[PDB]
Amino acid sequence: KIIVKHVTVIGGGLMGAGIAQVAAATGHTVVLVDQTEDILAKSKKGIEESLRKVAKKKFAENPKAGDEFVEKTLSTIATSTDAASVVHSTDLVVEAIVQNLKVKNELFKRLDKFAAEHTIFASNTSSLQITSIANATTRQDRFAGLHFFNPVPVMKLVEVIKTPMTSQKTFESLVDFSKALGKHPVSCKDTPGFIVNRLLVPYLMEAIRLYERGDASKEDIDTAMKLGAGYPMGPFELLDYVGLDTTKFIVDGWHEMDAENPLHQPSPSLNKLVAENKFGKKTGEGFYKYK
Amino acid sequence: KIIVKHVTVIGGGLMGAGIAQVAAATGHTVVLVDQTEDILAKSKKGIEESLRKVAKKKFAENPKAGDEFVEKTLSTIATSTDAASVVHSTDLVVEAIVQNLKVKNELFKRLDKFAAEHTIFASNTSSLQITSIANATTRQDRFAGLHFFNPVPVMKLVEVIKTPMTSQKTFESLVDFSKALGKHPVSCKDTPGFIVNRLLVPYLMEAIRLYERGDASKEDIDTAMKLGAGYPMGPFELLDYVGLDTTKFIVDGWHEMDAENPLHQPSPSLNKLVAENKFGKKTGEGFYKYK
Ligand SMILES: NC(=O)c1ccc[n+]([C@@H]2O[C@H](COP(=O)([O-])OP(=O)(O)OC[C@H]3O[C@@H](n4cnc5c(N)ncnc54)[C@H](O)[C@@H]3O)[C@@H](O)[C@H]2O)c1
Ligand SMILES: NC(=O)c1ccc[n+]([C@@H]2O[C@H](COP(=O)([O-])OP(=O)(O)OC[C@H]3O[C@@H](n4cnc5c(N)ncnc54)[C@H](O)[C@@H]3O)[C@@H](O)[C@H]2O)c1
The missing domain is CATH 3.40.50.720 (NAD(P)-binding Rossmann-like Domain)
Known part of the structure; x- marks a missing residue:
């Protein structure tokens, strides 16, 4: 040793x-x-x-x-x-x-x-x-x-x-x-x-999906998890913080090796943003815009 | 008004x-x-x-x-x-x-x-x-x-x-x-x-499944989510806090309503603990033993 x-x-x-x-x-x-x-x-x-x-x-x-x-x-x-x-x-x-x-x-x-x-x-x-x-x-x-x-x-x-x-x-x-x-x-x-990541990312994807479904707003989801769960950052502030490109990467990967798993289906919104170079805090904009 | x-x-x-x-x-x-x-x-x-x-x-x-x-x-x-x-x-x-x-x-x-x-x-x-x-x-x-x-x-x-x-x-x-x-x-x-609950319970179950798979211990998984995601409580500590039976009841309902969604697949361990009336803090025992 x-x-x-x-x-x-x-x-x-x-x-x-x-x-x-x-x-x-x-x-x-x-x-x-x-x-x-x-x-x-x-x-x-x-x-x-x-x-x-x-x-x-x-x-x-x-x-x-x-x-x-x-x-x-x-x-x-x-x-x-x-x-x-x-x-x-x-x-x-x-x-x-x-x-x-x-x-x-x-x-x-x-x-x-x-x-x-x-x-x-x-x-x-x-x-x-x-x-x-x-x-x-x-x-x-x-x-x-x-x-x-x-x-x-x-x-x-x-x-x-x-x-x-x-x-x-x-x-x-x-x-x-x-x-x-x-x-x-x-x-x-x-x-x-x-x-x-195995427990954070799939969750971050679900939040996105709940939004895309129009079930609730991003600002709300963020408030809900911060106050109702005590999380430091709402899921969308976290996505922008860790990088939308980084996230999409890990998920495309998981999806690739298990195309059928629902936990990894790709998100139209995450893709669009990423295709638009909006990677979050890194690029001054992700799901939210920044200073 | x-x-x-x-x-x-x-x-x-x-x-x-x-x-x-x-x-x-x-x-x-x-x-x-x-x-x-x-x-x-x-x-x-x-x-x-x-x-x-x-x-x-x-x-x-x-x-x-x-x-x-x-x-x-x-x-x-x-x-x-x-x-x-x-x-x-x-x-x-x-x-x-x-x-x-x-x-x-x-x-x-x-x-x-x-x-x-x-x-x-x-x-x-x-x-x-x-x-x-x-x-x-x-x-x-x-x-x-x-x-x-x-x-x-x-x-x-x-x-x-x-x-x-x-x-x-x-x-x-x-x-x-x-x-x-x-x-x-x-x-x-x-x-x-x-x-x-839509964004928290399925995560809690995923934490349980990671453990059931033998990939990591409950202790490390909780430490992982607290220090790595800043969460107040690890998923297992939280599970014992919100009630294993409470948790279970919700998941079952979702499973019955969507018998094919893998996110709602019953957890052998979760069912065993409930069967043994170990619901968490409100029992003195669940995934952990209290007081
Ligand atoms: N960004 C995160 O928060 C985070 C968390 C965990 C893991 N990761 C992963 O960890 C890695 C680190 O990413 P990063 O954010 O610091 O990126 P980065 O692009 O800032 O740094 C990577 C560096 O690798 C160098 N490099 C490439 N090929 C090399 C070679 N053959 N020899 C020596 N150097 C070489 C590049 O020149 C570059 O400076 C990534 O692959 C990433 O996916 C990222
Ligand atoms: N326990 C939790 O942590 C938790 C979290 C979220 C939501 N809930 C939900 O919130 C509600 C409240 O749960 P709780 O924890 O206080 O449970 P509880 O069982 O302690 O309280 C329920 C009360 O309802 C009364 N009751 C039942 N049928 C009644 C009737 N017909 N008329 C009048 N009173 C009646 C009971 O006597 C009892 O005092 C439930 O619908 C539950 O599913 C529970």
Whole structure:
């Protein structure tokens, strides 16, 4: 049982950068990876900005401290464009790149040849079976899902996904790692949607359908779930918040592998909006318009 | 323009007593109806204790005002075992009794002939279509759903259901009444589950099925939805809170009405717990053990 000290995060987007940020802020030695240096420098700048925002709202009584915090955490975030150059000495690889099974497998297959014997491989994906990706390597015992939620620095939850091949040693390691990041880990098999998404998304789709049916208004559905269920965000504010494109993606997928399941029939409204580039808060408009 | 001032509540259970308490606590004259004097004496005793509980905090700095509040509210709640005798000149009849369609229709067909012409009829039912009960009277235009949530005096939401026969005058009357109770009304057509239950129960069942499939434990699933979706209670904690038998009854109804919808497929575990009289908190045990 080895303790994860060096993390190699692959993906400089919202998730990857967040994962990198939290790992470094909790003492882990990180190497963020992306295709260009501009992508990387820009991703790291976002980390700094986010971290400084944290600093002020924690070290407001001694900026001198907040500065050390931010530079210390930032310094342990090395960067590289070819992950193959650092996996030979890394303890864990957390992938958070484009949802393309082929590209992911090509990545992990090559990474398999460079990685150390102990090195563990994890994917933060939400629309692919960890198993499909793990079979690109001959490291299945050290392969598993490590699912975070945006905004990673804030969401306390982390789903540790166990394939039929994940060893018990790999599992305890990521569980331990999850606690080391200050997050709370849960267990789930390699089933579509895992826990959260499997229970959130189908619900988000139902709300949409109740609206399309004209049974009630969006504003009302949102009020109904917030007040009658105590949810932080109404379903339509949540859809716009997590992305309409992101949502449609996971659902088209589920629908694809089970065309007959009613829980995944596509929504004309969600499609139209998505075809119109109205992805929610990201694009300033989804089911609602924004500032 | 009908302004609801005199309200007749039929049913002194958890929902009934709660609806009467709030109505009376917000300046409306109330007549609570039930089958026997003891029932009534107990319902009114609970209302009095709930109010005291509040008044002992709310008026800590004003004991006198606190008593006046409790007495005035209490004395604005009359009791009776003869509904027909009360609705002679009432403005609103809110029904919250045993979930038997046959019994509700009889009660309403009868009340319909004694109530004043302007009296609006409403049902707080969760497992019946308002249209059905409405057609037991010849006052359908004055018949609607007025759905509250336990604990009534706390939950600020109220679903105002309008059938395709309900008048706008009626709808608006109940919307103003809702605000008068200090609640926040939302509109939904007469469709099974309306909004909250229609979007919450099937989710709760999906949580149960995920567990029945063995994909994840109840504990992790609840932790997952709380930390990952910010929900106040995990689906299992919530299931024990709302009543496994209550939950079950609704789902069955939907299953009977739609025997082929997979969202209403019975849950072996849910049926077992009910069969073993483990309904949740109101038993000390359901999916979990309490106190
Ligand atoms: N958006 C969410 O809240 C959320 C939650 C869970 C999971 N996910 C999934 O996690 C992934 C992370 O998404 P994101 O929002 O950060 O997106 P993003 O587009 O901002 O970041 C992805 C990054 O992957 C890089 N990349 C692509 N191919 C690469 C390769 N071969 N080598 C190195 N880098 C490569 C891209 O240049 C890009 O910067 C997505 O696939 C997404 O579906 C998203
Ligand atoms: N229990 C819940 O959490 C919950 C949540 C939502 C909706 N509901 C619905 O709300 C209504 C209220 O349920 P409750 O929890 O207070 O139940 P309850 O069984 O505690 O109360 C019902 C009351 O109705 C009385 N009653 C029955 N038939 C009657 C009749 N013909 N005339 C007069 N009184 C009669 C009973 O004596 C009893 O006091 C029901 O229709 C129920 O399906 C229940």
